[PDB]
Amino acid sequence: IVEGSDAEIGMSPWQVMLFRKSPQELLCGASLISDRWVLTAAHCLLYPPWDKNFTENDLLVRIGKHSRTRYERNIEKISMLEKIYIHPRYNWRENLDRDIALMKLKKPVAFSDYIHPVCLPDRETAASLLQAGYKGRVTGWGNLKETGQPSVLQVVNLPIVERPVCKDSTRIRITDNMFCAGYKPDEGKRGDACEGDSGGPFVMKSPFNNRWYQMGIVSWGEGCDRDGKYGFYTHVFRLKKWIQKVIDQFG
């Protein structure tokens, strides 16, 4: 996360770290959506251009974390994966269209002060909140700048951007399964996701019921926190039918 700040303790209790077994290293962010299901970006698990194709046994998830590198004894919980599910129309070839994946845990994780699931949006909450200018929140342990790494989880609040501005900022083909967020050059304020933040949540606090909803997944950008560029996020609601189908069938 570029130009963010240290998270408060328990600020993002749905935050998940995807961790590689060997070598031991951070792979991605992710989010807890129930006691047995974790949501992330497909490109965190499958991206052939970079020779990435992880299987269940390559990975762990670490839940309830704050420190990036420390083993947080008595606080974090580490879970093995039962099964990975990648969207069947995930477009790794072109533009990361439908950049979403689910991971089912081998055992349910116990909720605590530091571990708690985020809500997924219904159609109306999505319609009401996914509007240009409305701010969401992105969290992660990714790089602090484009070209270093944080001691603890970072947070940044960023406004959703008008679709034409998103489109006009890039040569990559954008789709309805994506939205973009970030400040414009004139707005003064800054901030963005960066490498390592992939797969983490873009969340919004509904002013109707005071609950946090995950509207996006950190998906792609061109550089980090560049003027005139914006971060792109998987549109979680647009893909919720798939999420529900997987959970209903394999839960």
Binding site: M11, S34, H116, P117, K205
Partner: peptide, 28 residues
């Protein structure tokens, strides 16, 4: 589940985090 999106150390205790008000203010 029914308790999703309510943080034990914030919503559940009626405590606000330092920047959530920034989000609320943008929801016009």
């Amino acid at each position: 589940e029914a308790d999703c999106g309510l943080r034990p150390l914030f919503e559940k205790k009626s405590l606000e985090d330092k920047t959530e008000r920034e989000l609320l203010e943008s929801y016009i």
